[PDB]
């Protein structure tokens, strides 16, 4: 037999998640790719990104702790 009965608790919310509950990362190592500007400039990628709004975008990764900001760089 492959029929299964479900029980539902519906009296009150048990938790409240953020509207941004499903969020995403971009690994900090992607900033070392020579093509970073082309990649994040892609209209196609931006369209896919917009689809997941609202969401946090975490820029971070193992490389976070090996990245130094240089105001002089081109």
């Amino acid at each position: 037999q492959d029929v299964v009965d479900l029980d539902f608790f519906t009296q009150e919310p048990l938790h409240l998640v953020s509207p941004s509950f499903l969020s995403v990362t971009i690994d900090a190592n992607l900033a070392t790719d020579p093509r970073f500007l082309i990649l994040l400039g892609s209209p196609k990628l931006r369209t896919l990104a917009r689809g997941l709004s609202p969401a946090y975008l975490r820029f971070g990764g193992t490389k976070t702790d090996f990245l130094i900001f240089d105001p002089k760089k081109e």
Partner: protein
């Protein structure tokens, strides 16, 4: 891993991408910049904060990634107490900046092994007052050794439950009521499992992680990665969406912020996994009071789900996801109710089309599949 520099240009590309996509950027700062006596040297951060202020960028911050493994990665050990003090110093810098109300999250520790739990607890004692959410990371498997069977194994899925409980034990003991975020998470570490992390089979883990996170009190889950080198990407190198992207989109369109509970009657809760939320109110088709059930079937046969009173006769919409062949669960293409999901063009996501079921019918869930079901006119007051 070696030090590397990044430019004002790189910052602008990142911010622009986030801002034009309706995403809220969180930027991780380098925590391995230490002084003589191993305090955090904040001066490089200052330069970045100054630049972002001048450009008027609205950004949230983190400091460090997986500090539990700094000894392995950089041969430097930073304990949790010190790390907490470092966050206190960043918090002072943010408060003196033009966005003095910017959010700060941390410490982005790995899953709670004994040594990591200790670091997290000492960090929350020291620095827990100035963080807006506690971030930690979780992975099920090693991408090098993960198998297909591992991706389908309820015992592997179940391991996440204990990690969540352990994190909440640490948090309740130090900063009770502080929000808890998964700050980096995926199927498998080391960049993902080749030919598994980018397939339909990846969805069993991702959808279950979402369900459990929401059910257990995790407020935000951050998927490693949206786009990137790792196989666990939502979007591949051609800017094409993989099955987890489509699952993530569907999840977002259907699932509301109020979390409820579902469970299956009987001693076998392992292979049929069920979650229940209020329906996302911003969805134009549905109304206040509707419910969104989602279910994963890890059995090798179809199961038929019966809804309890008083929902047993309601109109239900099905949103069943199944792979496009010939590669089965290892497919990188997915069908929604038998229609392949594909972009309409570079600017246009397709509509996500429901399949209305006969009122009073049991909900069919084929073997090795996942589906959402919206119960229309459920009239649940907790959702309204």
């Amino acid at each position: 891993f070696k030090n590397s520099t990044y430019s004002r240009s790189s910052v602008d590309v990142l911010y622009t991408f986030a801002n034009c996509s309706g995403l809220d950027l969180i930027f991780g700062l380098n925590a391995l910049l230490r002084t003589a006596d191993l305090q955090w040297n904040s001066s490089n951060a200052q330069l970045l904060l100054d630049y972002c202020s001048s450009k008027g960028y609205n950004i949230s911050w983190e400091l460090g990634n997986e500090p539990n493994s700094f000894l392995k990665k950089a041969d430097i050990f930073i304990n949790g107490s010190q790390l907490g003090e470092d966050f206190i110093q960043l918090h002072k810098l943010l408060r003196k900046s033009t966005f003095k109300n910017a959010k700060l999250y941390g410490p982005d520790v790995g899953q709670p092994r004994r040594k990591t739990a200790k670091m997290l607890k000492s960090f929350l004692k020291a620095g827990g007052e100035v963080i807006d959410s506690v971030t930690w990371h979780h992975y099920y498997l090693n991408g090098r050794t993960a198998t297909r069977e591992d991706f389908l194994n309820p015992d592997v899925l179940d391991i996440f439950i204990s990690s969540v409980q352990k994190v909440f034990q640490v948090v309740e003991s130090t900063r009770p009521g502080k929000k808890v975020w998964l700050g980096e998470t995926s199927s498998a570490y080391g960049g993902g499992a080749p030919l598994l992390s980018d397939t339909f089979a990846a969805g069993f883990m991702w959808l279950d992680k979402l369900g459990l996170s929401a059910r257990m009190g995790i407020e935000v889950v951050m998927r490693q990665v949206f786009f990137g080198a790792g196989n666990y990407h939502l979007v591949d190198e051609n800017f094409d969406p993989l099955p987890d992207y489509w699952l993530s989109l569907l999840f977002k369109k259907l699932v509301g912020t109020k979390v409820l509970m579902a469970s299956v009657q009987g001693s076998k809760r392992r292979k049929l996994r069920v979650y229940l939320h209020c329906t996302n109110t911003d969805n134009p088709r549905y109304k206040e009071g509707d419910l969104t059930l989602y279910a994963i079937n890890l059995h090798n046969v179809t199961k038929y789900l019966r809804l309890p009173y008083p929902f047993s006769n309601k109109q239900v919409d099905k949103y069943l996801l199944r792979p496009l062949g010939p590669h089965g669960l290892l497919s990188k293409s997915v069908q929604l109710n038998g229609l392949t999901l594909k972009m309409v063009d570079d600017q246009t996501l397709p509509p996500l089309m429901e399949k209305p079921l006969r009122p009073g019918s049991s909900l069919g869930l084929p073997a090795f599949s996942y589906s959402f079901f919206v119960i229309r006119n459920a009239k649940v007051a907790a959702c309204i």
